Amino acid sequence: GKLFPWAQIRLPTAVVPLRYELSLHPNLTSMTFRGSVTISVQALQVTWNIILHSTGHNISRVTFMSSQEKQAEILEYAYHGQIAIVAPEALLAGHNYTLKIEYSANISSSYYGFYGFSYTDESNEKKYFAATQFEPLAARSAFPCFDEPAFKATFIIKIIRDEQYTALSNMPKKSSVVLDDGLVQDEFSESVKMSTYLVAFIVGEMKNLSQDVNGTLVSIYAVPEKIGQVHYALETTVKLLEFFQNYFEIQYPLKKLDLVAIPDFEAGAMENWGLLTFREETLLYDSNTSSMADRKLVTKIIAHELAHQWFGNLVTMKWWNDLWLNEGFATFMEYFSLEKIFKELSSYEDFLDARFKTMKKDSLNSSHPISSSVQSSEQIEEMFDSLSYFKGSSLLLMLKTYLSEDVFQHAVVLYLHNHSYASIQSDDLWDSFNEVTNQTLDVKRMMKTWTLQKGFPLVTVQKKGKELFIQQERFFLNSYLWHIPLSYVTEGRNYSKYQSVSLLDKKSGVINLTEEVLWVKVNINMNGYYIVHYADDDWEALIHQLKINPYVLSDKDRANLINNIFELAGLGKVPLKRAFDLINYLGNENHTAPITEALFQTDLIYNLLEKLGYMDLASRLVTRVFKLLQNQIQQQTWTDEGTPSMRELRSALLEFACTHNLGNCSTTAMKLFDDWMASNGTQSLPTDVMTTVFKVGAKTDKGWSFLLGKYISIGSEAEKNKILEALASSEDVRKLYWLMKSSLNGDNFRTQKLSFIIRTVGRHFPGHLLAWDFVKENWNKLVQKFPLGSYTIQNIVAGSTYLFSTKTHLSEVQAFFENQSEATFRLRCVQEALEVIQLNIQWMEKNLKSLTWWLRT
Ligand SMILES: *[C@@H]1O[C@H](CO)[C@@H](O[C@@H]2O[C@H](CO)[C@@H](O[C@@H]3O[C@H](CO[C@H]4O[C@H](CO[C@H]5O[C@H](CO)[C@@H](O)[C@H](O)[C@@H]5O)[C@@H](O)[C@H](O[C@H]5O[C@H](CO)[C@@H](O)[C@H](O)[C@@H]5O)[C@@H]4O)[C@@H](O)[C@H](O)[C@@H]3O)[C@H](O)[C@H]2NC(C)=O)[C@H](O)[C@H]1NC(C)=O
Ligand SMILES: *[C@@H]1O[C@H](CO)[C@@H](O[C@@H]2O[C@H](CO)[C@@H](O[C@@H]3O[C@H](CO[C@H]4O[C@H](CO)[C@@H](O)[C@H](O)[C@@H]4O)[C@@H](O)[C@H](O[C@H]4O[C@H](CO)[C@@H](O)[C@H](O)[C@@H]4O)[C@@H]3O)[C@H](O)[C@H]2NC(C)=O)[C@H](O)[C@H]1NC(C)=O
Ligand SMILES: *[C@@H]1O[C@H](CO)[C@@H](O[C@@H]2O[C@H](CO)[C@@H](O[C@@H]3O[C@H](CO[C@H]4O[C@H](CO[C@H]5O[C@H](CO)[C@@H](O)[C@H](O)[C@@H]5O)[C@@H](O)[C@H](O)[C@@H]4O)[C@@H](O)[C@H](O)[C@@H]3O)[C@H](O)[C@H]2NC(C)=O)[C@H](O)[C@H]1NC(C)=O
Ligand SMILES: *[C@@H]1O[C@H](CO)[C@@H](O[C@@H]2O[C@H](CO)[C@@H](O[C@@H]3O[C@H](CO)[C@@H](O)[C@H](O)[C@@H]3O)[C@H](O)[C@H]2NC(C)=O)[C@H](O)[C@H]1NC(C)=O
Numbered sequence: 001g002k003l004f005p006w007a008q009i010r011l012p013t014a015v016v017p018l019r020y021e022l023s024l025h026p027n028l029t030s031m032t033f034r035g036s037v038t039i040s041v042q043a044l045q046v047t048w049n050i051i052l053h054s055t056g057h058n059i060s061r062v063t064f065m066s067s068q069e070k071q072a073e074i075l076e077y078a079y080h081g082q083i084a085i086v087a088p089e090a091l092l093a094g095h096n097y098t099l100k101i102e103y104s105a106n107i108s109s110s111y112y113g114f115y116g117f118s119y120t121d122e123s124n125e126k127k128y129f130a131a132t133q134f135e136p137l138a139a140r141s142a143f144p145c146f147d148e149p150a151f152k153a154t155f156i157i158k159i160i161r162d163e164q165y166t167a168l169s170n171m172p173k174k175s176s177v178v179l180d181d182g183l184v185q186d187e188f189s190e191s192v193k194m195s196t197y198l199v200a201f202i203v204g205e206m207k208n209l210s211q212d213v214n215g216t217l218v219s220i221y222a223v224p225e226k227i228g229q230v231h232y233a234l235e236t237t238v239k240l241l242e243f244f245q246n247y248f249e250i251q252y253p254l255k256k257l258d259l260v261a262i263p264d265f266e267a268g269a270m271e272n273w274g275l276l277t278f279r280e281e282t283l284l285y286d287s288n289t290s291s292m293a294d295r296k297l298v299t300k301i302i303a304h305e306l307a308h309q310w311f312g313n314l315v316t317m318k319w320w321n322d323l324w325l326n327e328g329f330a331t332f333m334e335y336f337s338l339e340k341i342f343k344e345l346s347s348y349e350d351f352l353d354a355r356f357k358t359m360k361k362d363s364l365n366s367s368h369p370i371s372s373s374v375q376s377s378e379q380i381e382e383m384f385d386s387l388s389y390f391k392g393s394s395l396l397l398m399l400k401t402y403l404s405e406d407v408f409q410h411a412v413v414l415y416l417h418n419h420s421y422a423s424i425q426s427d428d429l430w431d432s433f434n435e436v437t438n439q440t441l442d443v444k445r446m447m448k449t450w451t452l453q454k455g456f457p458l459v460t461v462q463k464k465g466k467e468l469f470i471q472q473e474r475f476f477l478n479s480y481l482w483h484i485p486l487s488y489v490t491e492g493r494n495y496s497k498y499q500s501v502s503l504l505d506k507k508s509g510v511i512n513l514t515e516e517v518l519w520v521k522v523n524i525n526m527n528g529y530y531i532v533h534y535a536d537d538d539w540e541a542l543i544h545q546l547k548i549n550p551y552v553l554s555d556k557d558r559a560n561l562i563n564n565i566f567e568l569a570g571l572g573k574v575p576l577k578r579a580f581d582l583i584n585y586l587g588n589e590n591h592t593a594p595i596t597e598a599l600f601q602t603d604l605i606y607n608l609l610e611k612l613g614y615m616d617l618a619s620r621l622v623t624r625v626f627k628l629l630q631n632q633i634q635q636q637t638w639t640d641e642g643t644p645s646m647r648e649l650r651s652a653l654l655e656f657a658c659t660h661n662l663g664n665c666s667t668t669a670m671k672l673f674d675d676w677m678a679s680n681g682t683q684s685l686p687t688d689v690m691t692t693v694f695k696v697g698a699k700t701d702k703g704w705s706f707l708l709g710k711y712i713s714i715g716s717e718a719e720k721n722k723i724l725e726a727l728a729s730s731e732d733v734r735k736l737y738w739l740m741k742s743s744l745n746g747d748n749f750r751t752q753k754l755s756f757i758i759r760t761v762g763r764h765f766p767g768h769l770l771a772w773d774f775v776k777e778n779w780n781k782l783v784q785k786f787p788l789g790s791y792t793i794q795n796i797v798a799g800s801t802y803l804f805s806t807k808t809h810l811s812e813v814q815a816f817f818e819n820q821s822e823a824t825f826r827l828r829c830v831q832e833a834l835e836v837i838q839l840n841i842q843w844m845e846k847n848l849k850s851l852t853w854w855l856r857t
């Protein structure tokens with residue numbers, strides 16, 4: 001880079017793009033493409049060079065176009081992904097110029113950038129498909145551009161395809177001219193002002209189902225064989241689109257909106273303006289073969305991706321340090337829209353579980369402020385983590401419960417209007433709230449520690465007569481104050497309940513209770529991003545109540561108490577026995593949210609013990625939890641009867657009983673599976689129990705082979721994923737290895753399912769070591785397919801490491817990562833992984849001998 005005219009990661013500010021015209025001629029059979037982009041730019045400062053982004057481009061020609069065309073010289077700096085155009089005459093300030101670069105390139109074999117893949121039809125024909133995934137930083141691999149989100153421009157896109165293939169892009173199509181040799185050239189209309197990471201184009205054989213919605217054509221695309229499965233998606237997109245245009249008070253601005261089920265896609269979906277793109281398993285749906293977890297997944301993702309058309313596309317963060325302004329808003333709007341127009345799905349259970357898991361991570365010293373400087377490519381990819389998504393929506397949810405829902409909307413609508421087709425940073429949002437409260441509250445001041453400081457506060461609560469003493473401190477095990485909007489509910493001696501709110505912006509304070517009260521619970525429904533720790537008498541009060549009658553608290557409040565007690569046991573604020581004391585109430589619980597959280601704490605302790613060789617202790621622990629839930633597990637029916645939350649409770653209890661061979665569930669499941677196999681896979685299996693039935697079946701070599709045959713045979717991808725979870729839960733190490741190797745190479749299983757497979761293998765005893773070895777031995781190939789730092793990698797590092805609980809393993813994991821580049825060693829997921837092992841070591845030090853005692857007999 002020493003003879004390159006630019007020394008920094010971030011492009012200069014002296015030249016800005018106005019309009020791109022991109023012409024691509026891709027070849028899916030040779031996996032290459034020819035390109036010619038033409039950029040109109042304006043120079044704001046006198047410069048001799050244009051610094052631009054480009055990787056993997058064999059550039060044949062560069063010309064400064066006018067009348068007279070001037071050839072220009074081009075320099076490359078691949079370490080920074082940058083190229084430098086040397087101008088023949090200096091670019092003057094206040095002038096604009098038009099640049100043209102003709103180039104050729106390979107189509108990607110990764111999931112990043114303009115990538116191409118191959119699939120097999122039902123008629124057993126091989127088919128070719130090409131698609132884009134640019135966010136965060138791959139647009140530059142497709143065409144030269146100013147590949148930073150603040151450089152918003154307009155795009156005209158042109159594709160030369162073979163006539164059998166459809167070409168979609170962000171904007172509607174304008175023209176189609178038929179050329180020689182079976183080729184068409186599709187031209188698309190010029191786009192709105194957008195960032196380069198949103199540009200998208202697809203080439204593949206696809207059918208469509210469309211509906212006009214008030215002048216905007218809404219279409220669902222999929223390969224021809226799956227087109228019968230897009231109806232639900234179409235219905236749901238219409239509902240959410242009219243809900244969002246109403247709540248935001250800004251119409252969706254493009255004449256069409258496409259949603260595309262891509263046969264091979266790593267993310268769950270991508271929010272490209274006008275061309276939303278999804279995994280097949282996250283868009284297609286069939287009530288006959290898809291569980292209610294599947295339904296809810298399709299509807300969540302749609303809600304999330306549609307919300308990005310306003311939060312992210314219309315209004316974009318200036319730089320990736322504020323990614324949470326896109327992803328936090330989209331995740332809030334996803335779960336908010338679901339509670340207003342799809343209450344029945346009880347999506348709040350999903351949002352609550354996700355916040356519980358984000359908080360465990362956010363509690364580690366390897367956590368970062370949700371707004372953190374990032375400059376390196378891997379630092380940018382790592383910004384796509386749970387904090388951006390679920391601590392960002394928790395910040396919004398804390399504000400929405402604090403201020404009115406009406407105040408919140410006012411601020412949202414004002415924010416989006418002011419900043420349409422432009423860029424924003426954190427303070428711009430805190431301003432819009434300040435304007436809506438007519439500057440009474442200083443939102444910018446209150447939101448400071450939540451935005452700039454990692455972690456969350458521990459609120460400690462003690463009752464003294466008719467008052468509550470409240471304090472706050474940082475939640476950590478070896479820092480500024482937070483402005484904490486506190487909520488409490490309390491039951492009086494006349495058995496009357498009251499709730500109120502108070503804002504703790506100092507270290508300590510006293511809440512005046514107007515009466516004397518039986519118990520008190522702070523942080524209603526965990527609408528605040530903090531953990532609450534009670535004095536001993538005040539835990540006991542809440543525990544005594546849960547045994548007498550748990551239903552004076554909501555089911556979110558009860559899930560919150562189980563999560564907080566166990567997380568406070570890890571910290572050491574309460575002995576582990578008090579956690580177990582609390583979930584002894586579970587005999588009277590029959591709601592999903594609390595049972596789900598108890599089973600997770602239970603299963604996490606089981607999976608830890610099992611790896612350490614304490615197979616006896618683990619099993620004692622599940623049999624004690626089984627007795628607590630015995631009545632609930634035995635009521636369960638093997639059907640799809642009931643509300644969504646009851647169907648989800650059914651799957652959790654039958655999965656927990658079958659997995660630990662408790663009761664006769666094993667036997668019921670084997671009988672149902674064996675009758676399924678006799679039918680040759682044609683008998684009705686209830687969707688709710690299909691994971692569980694398959695898993696039991698996959699434990700024999702006959703049933704394993706049978707399941708595999710239908711995996712490569714059936715048309716329901718959601719059913720295929722239940723088969724894959726059952727296949728990957730075999731105890732036959734040869735088969736597990738064969739499953740990972742196969743997904744990694746793209747044969748039979750697609751590389752998109754690898755993270756799922758690796759994690760399933762690594763969760764149980766047979767594959768535990770196997771999965772971590774596959775990760776270590778295939779690290780370099782993994783990082784060819786998935787970018788270093790991205791969520792797929794974070795998910796693989798975490799899922800293969802987090803059940804290690806020995807000093808030896810700690811040093812192994814650390815030393816393996818030190819043998820990689822510093823960029824790899826200093827990845828946040830790698831550091832978080834090392835801290836989680838260290839906490840396992842200490843948790844076992846503190847709690848093992850006493851756990852052996854309460855399970856003695
Ligand atoms: C990327 O590089 C490619 C390599 O140079 C380039 O060339 C294209 O390559 C692909 C892949 O090989 C070809 O697609 C395949 O085409 C064949 C043959 O298609 C022709 O024949 C069929 C039917 O006749 C066949 O029938 C029997 C069995 O039925 C065969 O045994 C027999 O030998 C015959 O091949 C016919 O239906 C096709 O007609 C199509 O196109 C015409 C106009 O071109 C239309 O009138 C018609 O409606 C129809 O759409 C065709 O004449 C086929 O068997 C495969 O299934 C597959 O379709 C391309 O044909 C080939 N193109 C050319 C011009 O050579 C790619 O073009 C290049 N891509 C880009 C974007 O540049
Ligand atoms: C999760 O768990 C909670 C707690 O167990 C459930 O709530 C309970 O639901 C049961 C339903 O079986 C309730 O029991 C019902 O009692 C009703 C009337 O109670 C009055 O009368 C009894 C004596 O009969 C007194 O003890 C009491 O003080 C009341 O004054 C009955 O009407 C019900 O029987 C009905 O069904 C049968 C057969 O269908 C009919 O033949 C009858 O005519 C009658 O209509 C039933 O016995 C219990 O009271 C509830 N308790 C609480 C605390 O809520 C939730 O339902 C459960 N949730 C889920 C999703 O499973
Ligand atoms: C069960 O027993 C309880 C006993 O507390 C009964 O509830 C109380 O009922 C009495 C009589 O009706 C109420 O007394 C009245 O209170 C009026 C004030 O109402 C508003 O303020 C209350 C408290 O305000 C102070 O405290 C809070 C918390 O620190 C601060 O934020 C405020 O700024 C104040 O300093 C709220 O509880 C209430 O909902 C209103 O917001 C007052 O104007 C009247 O003149 C009278 O004094 C008493 O407020 C009730 N207490 C509570 C906690 O609700 C209940 O009725 C009994 N059960 C049955 C069935 O009757
Ligand atoms: C450099 O290139 C820019 C970009 O094209 C030129 O600026 C452009 O100027 C025209 C007007 O001369 C703008 O069009 C206007 O649009 C508004 C509303 O959309 C309309 O009311 C006007 O009647 C007019 O049509 C245009 O928006 C503006 N920029 C862009 C990005 O479109 C500029 O003139 C060129 N030359 C120089 C010396 O800078």
Ligand SMILES: *[C@@H]1O[C@H](CO)[C@@H](O[C@@H]2O[C@H](CO)[C@@H](O)[C@H](O)[C@H]2NC(C)=O)[C@H](O)[C@H]1NC(C)=O
Pocket residue numbers: 208209210211212219
């Ligand atoms: C697939 O999409 C096309 C549009 O791209 C649909 O055919 C169009 O129908 C719309 C209204 O639904 C009209 O605005 C267009 O003029 C039609 N175009 C053509 C070329 O006929 C078609 O209906 C969609 N397929 C399904 C099954 O809905």
Ligand SMILES: *[C@@H]1O[C@H](CO)[C@@H](O[C@@H]2O[C@H](CO)[C@@H](O)[C@H](O)[C@H]2NC(C)=O)[C@H](O)[C@H]1NC(C)=O
Pocket residue numbers: 214215245251
């Ligand atoms: C259906 O489309 C029309 C036209 O796009 C919408 O009317 C627009 O509403 C916005 C918001 O107030 C105005 O800024 C435009 O000027 C209106 N356009 C026209 C032509 O009147 C209409 O709101 C849409 N339907 C719904 C339910 O929102």
Ligand SMILES: *[C@@H]1O[C@H](CO)[C@@H](O[C@@H]2O[C@H](CO)[C@@H](O)[C@H](O)[C@H]2NC(C)=O)[C@H](O)[C@H]1NC(C)=O
Pocket residue numbers: 365366478
């Ligand atoms: C927690 O992590 C922080 C940073 O992630 C560590 O703080 C650094 O400590 C070194 C000590 O040599 C300093 O050079 C750095 O400046 C510190 N970073 C910051 C941001 O101040 C700290 O060591 C860790 N703490 C614990 C208890 O593990």
Ligand SMILES: *[C@@H]1O[C@H](CO)[C@@H](O[C@@H]2O[C@H](CO)[C@@H](O)[C@H](O)[C@H]2NC(C)=O)[C@H](O)[C@H]1NC(C)=O
Pocket residue numbers: 414418428431432435
């Ligand atoms: C629109 O957004 C602009 C930012 O472009 C807001 O301007 C900020 O306003 C606050 C409070 O007045 C100031 O402290 C900032 O310094 C301003 N920023 C800039 C860059 O000027 C403006 O408040 C918003 N307008 C409306 C009508 O809401």
Ligand SMILES: *[C@@H]1O[C@H](CO)[C@@H](O[C@@H]2O[C@H](CO)[C@@H](O)[C@H](O)[C@H]2NC(C)=O)[C@H](O)[C@H]1NC(C)=O
Pocket residue numbers: 512513514515
């Ligand atoms: C805490 O709340 C209690 C109950 O509302 C307050 O006690 C009341 O105080 C008012 C105002 O002085 C008196 O008129 C009543 O006689 C009291 N009621 C009862 C039932 O005792 C107390 O003043 C509050 N303290 C603070 C610091 O706000």
Ligand SMILES: *[C@@H]1O[C@H](CO)[C@@H](O[C@@H]2O[C@H](CO)[C@@H](O)[C@H](O)[C@H]2NC(C)=O)[C@H](O)[C@H]1NC(C)=O
Pocket residue numbers: 680681709710713
């Ligand atoms: C059970 O289902 C399987 C599909 O997994 C069937 O296997 C197919 O059978 C037909 C002919 O019967 C062949 O044309 C296909 O190629 C087979 N698919 C394969 C082997 O992957 C099987 O036939 C079904 N059982 C019965 C009794 O019909």
Ligand SMILES: O=S(=O)(Nc1cccc(-c2nnn[nH]2)c1)c1cc(Br)c(Cl)s1
Pocket residue numbers: 266267268269300301304350354384385386389791
């Ligand atoms: O691949 S995703 O699984 N797809 C996806 C996209 C949007 C929202 C959700 C969601 N909603 N509720 N829970 N998750 C999931 C994922 C990527 C990153 Br970065 C995450 Cl954080 S999640």
Ligand SMILES: *[C@@H]1O[C@H](CO)[C@@H](O)[C@H](O)[C@H]1NC(C)=O
Pocket residue numbers: 058059060104
């Ligand atoms: C670059 O493109 C030129 C012109 O098409 C071609 O001759 C040359 O082989 C290409 N080089 C590489 C390394 O792709």
Ligand SMILES: *[C@@H]1O[C@H](CO)[C@@H](O)[C@H](O)[C@H]1NC(C)=O
Pocket residue numbers: 056057058104105106
């Ligand atoms: C395309 O791939 C081949 C094989 O890896 C490589 O030699 C060539 O340089 C690639 N093209 C570009 C433009 O990098």
Ligand SMILES: *[C@@H]1O[C@H](CO)[C@@H](O)[C@H](O)[C@H]1NC(C)=O
Pocket residue numbers: 634664667668
């Ligand atoms: C299992 O035992 C329960 C009683 O706990 C009984 O109702 C059920 O029928 C039994 N299941 C089978 C398959 O025998």
Ligand SMILES: [Zn+2]
Pocket residue numbers: 271304308326327330
């Ligand atoms: Zn998103």
